[PDB]
């Protein structure tokens, strides 16, 4: 329970989970709701905001950095999978920058 | 200001030595390079040279502020290439290592 991960759980988490951008990320990507049966073939470590906040919740993370990459991994796993010009890319891109706000005024 | 100079001195330093760094030393030449679809895809290039420079001049008013310029750099990367493309996993490797040594900045700025 360091300073740094309080910081992320009440800080960066609060402020990206309750976003109105946040919604497609705040659960694991369901490839067969969402009808992309190739994501799991391109995209090999998923992540979510609802994992990354049960593992704040349940002292999962043993240092910020290890946090901080799971955020990453959702926002590059976005990137990399959808199209370009796809809304979702909007919308990661926007939360990351939040994420990237909030992270520069982090405990150290 | 001192995260400034942190993002210059340590992060930069460490970033730009890297084997996998030398992609993002300097803008994407679109000409040089054979990629003609870079630019209609990508409408804000980012790369390490320019903030570098950036940072040199004095810029940049907030850590913040050159934060997102990194973080443009590598969402552009991800965005234009395809996902097996050896370059993302360049880009991965480097943004790891700027989260790292941002976790480590100073937290005041001044």
């Known amino acids: 329970v360091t300073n740094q991960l309080q910081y992320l759980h009440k800080v960066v988490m609060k402020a990206l989970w309750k976003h109105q951008f946040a919604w497609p990320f705040r659960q ?16 090999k470590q998923p992540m ?6 049960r593992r ?14 799971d955020f990453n991994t959702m926002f590059t796993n976005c ?4 199209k370009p010009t ?8 926007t939360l990351e920058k939040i994420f990237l706000q909030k992270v520069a005024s982090m405990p150290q």
């Open 28 to 43: 694991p990507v369901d490839a067969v709701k969402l009808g992309l049966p190739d994501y799991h073939k391109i995209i």
């Open 48 to 53: 979510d905001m609802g994992t990354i906040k």
């Open 56 to 69: 704040l919740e349940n002292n999962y993370y043993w240092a910020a950095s290890e946090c901080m990459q």
């Open 79 to 82: 990137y990399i999978y959808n």
């Open 86 to 93: 796809d809304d979702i890319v909007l919308m990661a891109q």
